């Protein structure tokens, strides 16, 4: 139902935030 | 409700499109 | 409706998995 969808949004939003962190590291590490 | 979920989909979809643009720049800039 | 939302989640989840594959290739190819 709606609650299930909202829980999958939050997971997707955490997948995206981590991707953004990896992208930053690819550009700036070192 | 459903409308709220659809508005968070559209935001997620814009987060992803920008990520794809940054990935392209990482590979091809210069 | 809910089914439509679930179909857009699955698409988003495939967009993310491919992004993760491209990120891995950027780091490790070669
Ligand atoms: Cu969603």
User: Residues of C1-30 as b/e, b for ≥16 C-beta within 10 angstroms?
Assistant: eeeebeebbeebeebbeebeeebeeeeeee
Q: Distance between CA B24 and CA A3 in Å, rounded? A: 35
Q: Distance between CA C17 and CA C20 in Å, rounded? A: 5
C-alpha C18 – ligand 1 centre gap (Å) = 17
> Testing the interface with C: which of B12, B14, B17, B29 to mutate, by most C Cβ within 10 A?
B12
Resolution in A: 1.5
Give partners of A (≥3 CB pairs < 8 A).
Answer: B, C
Q: Distance between CA A14 and CA A10 in Å, rounded? A: 6
Provide the domain limits for residue C22.
1-30
Q: Which residues have a Cβ under 8 Å from the Cβ of B5 and sit 6 or more positions away?
A: A2, A5, A6, A9, C5
As to burial, measured by CB atoms within 10 angstroms (0-12 exposed, 13-18 middle, 19+ buried), residue B26 is: middle
C-alpha A12 – ligand 1 centre gap (Å) = 8
Which residues in B1-30 belong to E strands, given as ranges?
none
- Number of domains present in the structure of chain A: 1
CB C9 within 8 A of CB A12: yes
């Amino acid at each position: 139902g709606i609650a299930a969808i909202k829980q999958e949004h939050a997971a997707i939003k955490q997948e995206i935030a981590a991707i953004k962190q990896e992208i930053a590291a690819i550009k700036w590490e070192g």
